[PDB]
Nucleic acid binder design. Structure first.
Ligand SMILES: Nc1ncnc2c1ncn2[C@@H]1O[C@H](COP(=O)(O)OP(=O)(O)OP(=O)(O)O)[C@@H](O)[C@H]1O
Ligand SMILES: Nc1ncnc2c1ncn2[C@@H]1O[C@H](COP(=O)(O)OP(=O)(O)OP(=O)(O)O)[C@@H](O)[C@H]1O
Ligand SMILES: [Mg+2]
Ligand SMILES: [Mg+2]
Lengths: 285, 56, 372, 401
DNA sequence: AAAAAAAAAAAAAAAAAAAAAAAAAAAAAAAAA
DNA sequence: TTTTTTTTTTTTTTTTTTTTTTTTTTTTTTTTT
C-alpha cells in the first residue's frame, strides 16, 4: 500500500462466496495449532468481522482448554477485569493487586510453577475502545511473552501499530494472517460508543404549569425568531404560573433533564430549528 | 445472539481443570517435527553461544 | 373524637387497598403478568412516574394479590435500603433463602444464576427506586436486566423509577437487542377529577363526607393538579385544612376561604436591609454580576457612612450575608478566602423591595449612586 | 482486661460517667445579686416557659398531639436562623407531652433524638437511633437492618416513636439514602413514627433534596422568625426576673444592637453576661449603660484599625504601597514587583531607606499571616500575587489620624 | 481582519469508591489434667 | 482421652488513598461587522 502525500497537502452469490471463504479459513486451524505450539501468536487483520471465525476456532479446536475470551469492543472493559479474571477464576489467587504490572508479575510467577497448563486467550478487537492506550498494550504484550499463555487476536482499525513499539512487537511474537471475511460489524458496533417525536413524547408527560412555562418559552423564541431569565420570571409571575423563582429553576432543571431547552452563560436556547418549533406551536391549536 | 455477547461482562473464563506441548502425539511422532526440533535447537544454541562469546 | 380528627386519621398519606385513580394501569399490569404466566415466557418491565403518582401502591397491591400467589413467587426489594450497589445480590439471596458458600458478591451472583435456571416456580422481582443502582459502568443493572436472556430462566422483573428516560439514557445498550428491551410504562400525574374521586373515597371510608363540601374539594384538586398533580401533596393539603379548622374552631364544614388561605400559604434586621439594598444598588448600577464580599462591603461602608450608621466590620458582614443566604435570597460561592466569596442574587428586585417593606429607605439607597 | 470494658461499653452495661470534684460546689446563699444575675443570664439555663414562642409552641404541640393520638405518624420540618429557639421549643413540647403521658392524659410514646452534627457520617445515624432503643453499639448495616425490621413488620402493641432530627442538612449527601430512609419509614402503616426535622435554611427541601425526598417531607412547615428588639428585651427581662442588677435602658440597648445584626438570643444573653462581668470589676452593684456600651464595643469587635496602628514602620509603608499600586493600576490583585516599586517611591519620599526584597517578602509574610493582606507562598518571589484584605480607607484612617 | 459570543476543555474542589490496615471472630495446634 | 490456652487464618470494620463527579473558569472556535 502506497498512500499519496499530495492529497494531505492540497486539503445470491455473496452468501456462497462468504461460505467458501469461511471454509477456506476453517482449513487453517491445524496450521494455527502448529504455529501456536512453537511460541508464536495469531493476529488477524481482515476487513470483515472476525468474531465468528475466532468463536468457531474456540468451539472446534480449543474445546477442552482454559480459554479466556475477551471482548475488546466492550466499552466497559478494563484491564482490572481481565487481570482479576486471570488471578481469581483460573489461578484461584483472589483479587489482583491495583498495580497492573505487579499483577502481571504475579501471573508470570504463578504460571512459572505450572508447566503443561496453557491459558489461551482470544481477544476480539485488540484495538478496542478501552485497549487503545499504551498501558493496556504493555500489559497484553507482557502477558503474551509467557510460554504458557497463548494469544489469538483481531485487528480492525487502520492505525493499530501506532501504539506497538519494537519492544511490544517482539513481546507480541505475532504471526500475521489475512483473514478477510466479508461479514458486517453487527456485534462490534452495537454497543454504547457508536427529535420532535421525542419532544412531543416528553411534553405529553408534563403538567399544566410546566406546559404554560414551556409555552411561554417557545412563544417568546418564535416571536423574536436565548431568552433572559428575568423576563421569563415576570411572564410566569404575571400568569400566576409559579410561586417563587426557585420553582422556575426546578422546572428549568427538569427541562434540561429531558433535553428540551438549553441553558447558557441565563440564556435559554431551544436546540431545534425555528420551523419545527413553528409546527409544534401550530400543533396545539 | 451468542453466549459471549453479554451486555454485562467483557471476559469469559472457560476453566477446565486449572490450578494455582500443545499438539497431540500423532503430530510429534512424525519425523519432520523431530527433525525441525533438532535443527532449531542446534541453531538457537549456536546463536546463543555466539552472543555469549561476543558479550563476555 | 370528632369528625375533623377522623378525616385527619383516614386521609393518612399511607398505604391503602383501593386505588380509584389507577384502574387502567393495574389492569395493564395484570395483562402483562397473565400473558407472561400463561405463555411461560420471561419479560422485563420499567414503570416510571412523578413522585406521588401511585406506582409503589399498584405494585404493592399486585404483590398481595392471591391469584398470583400460587403460580409465581414474589420478591420486593427497595434499592435505597441496600448497603452498596454490588450488595443487592446478597439481599436477593436473603430474599430467596439460597444456600451460598458466601463472603463474596460473585458467589451470591452465581448462586442466583444457578437458582434462576432450574427454579420450580416463576419469579416476580420488583425493584423499587432503581435509580440508586446506577453507577459509572453499571455492571449491576446490566447484570440484573439480562436475566430474561438467561438460558431457561423464568424471572420477570419490574423496575420502578422517577425519570421517564432512565432506560434510554442509562440503559442504552439493552436497545441493541429487541429481546432485552424493557417494556416501558409511564404513570401519568393525576388530573382534577381523579383527585376528587380519591378524596371522596377516603372521606367515604369513614363516613366523614359531610365535613367537605364538593366546592372546596374541586378548588383544592384543581390547584394541586395545576401545580404538581401528585396525591401526596393532595392528602397533605387536605389534612392541613382539617388541622387548621380543628385548631381554629376549637360541626361546621370547611368553606372555600379556609382552603384558599391554606393554598396561599402553601402555593427584618437593619444591617441585613442595608446589605440587600447595597447589593440591589450594585446590581442596578453595574452590568457585572461578579460581586465579591469585599467589593460589596466597601460600598456598604460608604452607604452606612452616608446614613450615619456604625457599620459592621468584615467579620460580622460575612455572617450577615450568610444569615440572608439562609432565607434563599442570595447564594454564596465559597472560595479559599472569605473576601473572595461571590454573592449571587437569586430574587427579582421587586421581590426584594416587597420583602423589605421599607420603601423610604430603599428609595434613598438607589438615589445614592455617588457612593459606588 | 480493657476488652471486657469495651465489650460492656458496646453493649451499654457500664455508664460513661465522669470524674468528680474534690470540693463541694458553692451554695446560693454565699452569692451576690450580680452573681445570681450572671447565673440566670447563662444561655444554658433554659426556662420552662419560653417567652415570645407561644404560637410556635401551639403549632408544634397541636401537630405532635394529633400525630400521637391518631396513632399514624408523619413528618414536620421547622427551620430558621440560629438562636431563634427552635430546639428549645421542640424539646419543651416533647417535655410537656411526656408530662401529659406520665399522668395518663395521653397515649404513651418513645422519644428519640439525633443531631446531624454529632455524627461523623450520616450512616452513623442508624447507629444512634438503635443506640436509643436498646443501648447496643453495632455496625450501621446491622442497625439499619434491625430498624427496618422494627418499622416494617407490624407487631402489637407497638408504641408511637417521635424521632427528632437536628441539623437535617448534614444528613443530606449525594445519594440521599439516610434522609430517604428516615422520611420513608413514617409512610408505612406498621410504623408509628413521627419525624420532626429542624434546620436553618427555609428553602432546603427544594434546594438540595431530591424529588421523592421533598415529596415525602411534606408541606407542614414552621418558620421561626428572628427576634425583634421588643422580643429580646422581653427575653432578657424574663431572665433577670425580680432583680434590679440591670437598668431598663441597658437591656433596650442590647436588644436594639443585637436585633439589628442577627436577631439571635445567644448574642443578647452573652453580651448581657459580659456587661455583668464588666460591672463586677467597677465595684458597682448595678449594670449601667456605660458597661453595656463597653461590652458592645468588645463583643462586636472591629480591630483592623488598631492592627494597622500597631504595625511597624516598614509594614505601614508596605500597606500604603499596596493601596497606591491598587490606585495606580486599577486592578485589585497586584504583583510583588509593582508593590516594591511603589515601596521605593514612598520610602524615597519619606526619606527612610527600605529593606532589600528578601526582607520585604518577610514583611509580606508577616502581614499575610495576620490576614491584613492576602499573599501567596514566598517561593515565587517578585511575582507572587497580593490582595489587600483591609479596605483602602482603613489604612488612610489608621495612618493619617 | 477584529469584536464579541459560545461551546468545549481544563482546573479545582468535593464526594464516593476501592484499597489497605487493623481489629474481631472463628478455626487449629499444642499444652493441662 | 478430654479440656483449656495460645497461635493462625479468615472475615469484618475502619481509615486512607485514588478515582470520579460536579462546579467554575478559562480558552480556542465561530458569527457578525
Ligand atoms: N390511586 C390512588 N388512590 C388512592 N391513594 C393513592 C393512589 N395512588 C397513590 N396513593 C397514595 O399515595 C401513596 C403511594 O404513592 P407511591 O409511593 O406509589 O408514589 P411513588 O410514585 O412510589 O412515589 P416515589 O416515586 O416518590 O417513590 C400512598 O400513601 C397511597 O395512599
Ligand atoms: N424565647 C426564648 N426565651 C428564653 N430563652 C431563649 C428563647 N429563645 C432562645 N433562648 C435561649 O437561646 C438559646 C437558643 O438555643 P436553641 O437550641 O433553641 O437555638 P436553635 O435555634 O436550635 O439554634 P441552632 O439552629 O443553631 O441549633 C437557648 O439555649 C435558650 O436558652
Ligand atoms: Mg415508592
Ligand atoms: Mg438546635
Amino acid at each position: 500500500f502506497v498512500p499519496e502525500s499530495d492529497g494531505y497537502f492540497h486539503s445470491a452469490e455473496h452468501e456462497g462466496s462468504i461460505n467458501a471463504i469461511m471454509e477456506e479459513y476453517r482449513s487453517y486451524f491445524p496450521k494455527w495449532m502448529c504455529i501456536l505450539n512453537e511460541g508464536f501468536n495469531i493476529l488477524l487483520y481482515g476487513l470483515g468481522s472476525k468474531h465468528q471465525l475466532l468463536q468457531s476456532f474456540h468451539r472446534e479446536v480449543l474445546h477442552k482448554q482454559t480459554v479466556l475470551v475477551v471482548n475488546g469492543f466492550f466499552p466497559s472493559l478494563t484491564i482490572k477485569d481481565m487481570l482479576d479474571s486471570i488471578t481469581s477464576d483460573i489461578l484461584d489467587a483472589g483479587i489482583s493487586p491495583a498495580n497492573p504490572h505487579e499483577a502481571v508479575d504475579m501471573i508470570e510467577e504463578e504460571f512459572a510453577l505450572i508447566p503443561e497448563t496453557h491459558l489461551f486467550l482470544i481477544v476480539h478487537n485488540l484495538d478496542g475502545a478501552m485497549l487503545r492506550n499504551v498501558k493496556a498494550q504493555a500489559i497484553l504484550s507482557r502477558l503474551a511473552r509467557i510460554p504458557n499463555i497463548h494469544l489469538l487476536a483481531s485487528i480492525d482499525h487502520i492505525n493499530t501499530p501506532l501504539l506497538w513499539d519494537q519492544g511490544k512487537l517482539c513481546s507480541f511474537n505475532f504471526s500475521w494472517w489475512d483473514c478477510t471475511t466479508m461479514l458486517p460489524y453487527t456485534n462490534e458496533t452495537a454497543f454504547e460508543n457508536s427529535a420532535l417525536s421525542s419532544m412531543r413524547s416528553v411534553f405529553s408527560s408534563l403538567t399544566t404549569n410546566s406546559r404554560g412555562i414551556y409555552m411561554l418559552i417557545v412563544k417568546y423564541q418564535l416571536k423574536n425568531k436565548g431568552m433572559p431569565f428575568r423576563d421569563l420570571y415576570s411572564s410566569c409571575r404575571e400568569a400566576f404560573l409559579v410561586s417563587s423563582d426557585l420553582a422556575l429553576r426546578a422546572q428549568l432543571t427538569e427541562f434540561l433533564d429531558h433535553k428540551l431547552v438549553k441553558s447558557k452563560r441565563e440564556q435559554l436556547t431551544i436546540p431545534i430549528d425555528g420551523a419545527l418549533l413553528q409546527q409544534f406551536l401550530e400543533e396545539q391549536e | 445472539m451468542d453466549p459471549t455477547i453479554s451486555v454485562s461482562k467483557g471476559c469469559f473464563v472457560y476453566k477446565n481443570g486449572a490450578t494455582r506441548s500443545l499438539l497431540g502425539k500423532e503430530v510429534v511422532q512424525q519425523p519432520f517435527y523431530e527433525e525441525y526440533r533438532k535443527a532449531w535447537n542446534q541453531i538457537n544454541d549456536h546463536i546463543a553461544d555466539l552472543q555469549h562469546r561476543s558479550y563476555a | 373524637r370528632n369528625k375533623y380528627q377522623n378525616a385527619r386519621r383516614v386521609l393518612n398519606s399511607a398505604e391503602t387497598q383501593n386505588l380509584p385513580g389507577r384502574e387502567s394501569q393495574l389492569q395493564e399490569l395484570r395483562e402483562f403478568f397473565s400473558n407472561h404466566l400463561e405463555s411461560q415466557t420471561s419479560g422485563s418491565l420499567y414503570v416510571s412516574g412523578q413522585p406521588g403518582t401511585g406506582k409503589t401502591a399498584c405494585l404493592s397491591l399486585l404483590l398481595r394479590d392471591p391469584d398470583f400467589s400460587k403460580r409465581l413467587q414474589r420478591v420486593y426489594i427497595n434499592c435505597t435500603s441496600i448497603a452498596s450497589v454490588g450488595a443487592v445480590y446478597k439481599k436477593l439471596c436473603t430474599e430467596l433463602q439460597l444456600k451460598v458458600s458466601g463472603r463474596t458478591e460473585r458467589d451470591h451472583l452465581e448462586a442466583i444464576q444457578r437458582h434462576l435456571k432450574t427454579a420450580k416456580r416463576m419469579l416476580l422481582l420488583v425493584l423499587d427506586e432503581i435509580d440508586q443502582l446506577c453507577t459509572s459502568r453499571q455492571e449491576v443493572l446490566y447484570t440484573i436486566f439480562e436475566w430474561p436472556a438467561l438460558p431457561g430462566s423464568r424471572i420477570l422483573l419490574v423496575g420502578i423509577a422517577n425519570s421517564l428516560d432512565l432506560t434510554d439514557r442509562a440503559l442504552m445498550r439493552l436497545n441493541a437487542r429487541c429481546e432485552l428491551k424493557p417494556r416501558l410504562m409511564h404513570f401519568p400525574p393525576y388530573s382534577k377529577q381523579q383527585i376528587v374521586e380519591i378524596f371522596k373515597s377516603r372521606l367515604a371510608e369513614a363516613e366523614v363526607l359531610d365535613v367537605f363540601p364538593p366546592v372546596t374539594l374541586q378548588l383544592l384538586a384543581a390547584k394541586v393538579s395545576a401545580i404538581s398533580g401528585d396525591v401526596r401533596r393532595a392528602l397533605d393539603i387536605g389534612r392541613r385544612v382539617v388541622e387548621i379548622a380543628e385548631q381554629q374552631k376549637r360541626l361546621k364544614p370547611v368553606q372555600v376561604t379556609q382552603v384558599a388561605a391554606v393554598l396561599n400559604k402553601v402555593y427584618f434586621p437593619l444591617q441585613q436591609k442595608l446589605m440587600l439594598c447595597t447589593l440591589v444598588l450594585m446590581l442596578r448600577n453595574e452590568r457585572n454580576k461578579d460581586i465579591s464580599m469585599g467589593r460589596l462591603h466597601e460600598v456598604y461602608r460608604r452607604v452606612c457612612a452616608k446614613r450615619n450608621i456604625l457599620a459592621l466590620d468584615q467579620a460580622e458582614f460575612t455572617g450577615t450575608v450568610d444569615l440572608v443566604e439562609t432565607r434563599g435570597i442570595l447564594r454564596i460561592m465559597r472560595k479559599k478566602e472569605p473576601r473572595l466569596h461571590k454573592v449571587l442574587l437569586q430574587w427579582d428586585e421587586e421581590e426584594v423591595h416587597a420583602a423589605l417593606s421599607d420603601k423610604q429607605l430603599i428609595a434613598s439607597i438607589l438615589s445614592d449612586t455617588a457612593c459606588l | 482486661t480493657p476488652s471486657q470494658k469495651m465489650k460492656k461499653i458496646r453493649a451499654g452495661e457500664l455508664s460513661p460517667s465522669m470524674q468528680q470534684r474534690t470540693d463541694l460546689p458553692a451554695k446560693d446563699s454565699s452569692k451576690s445579686e450580680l452573681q445570681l444575675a450572671r447565673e440566670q443570664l447563662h444561655v444554658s439555663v433554659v426556662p420552662k416557659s419560653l417567652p415570645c414562642r407561644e404560637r410556635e409552641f401551639e403549632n408544634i404541640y397541636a401537630f405532635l398531639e394529633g400525630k400521637i393520638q391518631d396513632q399514624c405518624g408523619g413528618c414536620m420540618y421547622v427551620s430558621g436562623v440560629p438562636g431563634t429557639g427552635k430546639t428549645a421549643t421542640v424539646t419543651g413540647v416533647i417535655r410537656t407531652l411526656q408530662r401529659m403521658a406520665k399522668q395518663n392524659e395521653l397515649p404513651a410514646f418513645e422519644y428519640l433524638e439525633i443531631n446531624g452534627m454529632r455524627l461523623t457520617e450520616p450512616r452513623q445515624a442508624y447507629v444512634q437511633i438503635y443506640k436509643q432503643l436498646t443501648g447496643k453499639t453495632v455496625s450501621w448495616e446491622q442497625a439499619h437492618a434491625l430498624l427496618e425490621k422494627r418499622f416494617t413488620t407490624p407487631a402489637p402493641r407497638r408504641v408511637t416513636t417521635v424521632l427528632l432530627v437536628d441539623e437535617l442538612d448534614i444528613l443530606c449527601n449525594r445519594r440521599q439514602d439516610v434522609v430517604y430512609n428516615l422520611l420513608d419509614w413514617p409512610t408505612k402503616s406498621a410504623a408509628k413514627l413521627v419525624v420532626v426535622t429542624i434546620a436553618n435554611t427555609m428553602d432546603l427541601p427544594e434546594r438540595l433534596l431530591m424529588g421523592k425526598v421533598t415529596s415525602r417531607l411534606g408541606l407542614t412547615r414552621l418558620t421561626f422568625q428572628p427576634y425583634s428588639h421588643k422580643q429580646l428585651q422581653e427575653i432578657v427581662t424574663a431572665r433577670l426576673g425580680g432583680s434590679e442588677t440591670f437598668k431598663g435602658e441597658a437591656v433596650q440597648l442590647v436588644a436594639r444592637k443585637v436585633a439589628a445584626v442577627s436577631g439571635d438570643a445567644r448574642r443578647a444573653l452573652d453580651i448581657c453576661r459580659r456587661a455583668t462581668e464588666i460591672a463586677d470589676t467597677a465595684a458597682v452593684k448595678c449594670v449601667t449603660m456605660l458597661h453595656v456600651q463597653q461590652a458592645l464595643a468588645e463583643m462586636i469587635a472591629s480591630a483592623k484599625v488598631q492592627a494597622i496602628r500597631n504595625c511597624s514602620r516598614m509594614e505601614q509603608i508596605f500597606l500604603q504601597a499596596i493601596a497606591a499600586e491598587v490606585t495606580r493600576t486599577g486592578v485589585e490583585e497586584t504583583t510583588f514587583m509593582g508593590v516594591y516599586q511603589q515601596v521605593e517611591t514612598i520610602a524615597a519620599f519619606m526619606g527612610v531607606t527600605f529593606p532589600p526584597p528578601g526582607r520585604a517578602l518577610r514583611l509580606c509574610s508577616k502581614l499575610g499571616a495576620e490576614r491584613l493582606i492576602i499573599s501567596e507562598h514566598s517561593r515565587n518571589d517578585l511575582f507572587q500575587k497580593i490582595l489587600l484584605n483591609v479596605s483602602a480607607d482603613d489604612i488612610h484612617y489608621a495612618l493619617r489620624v
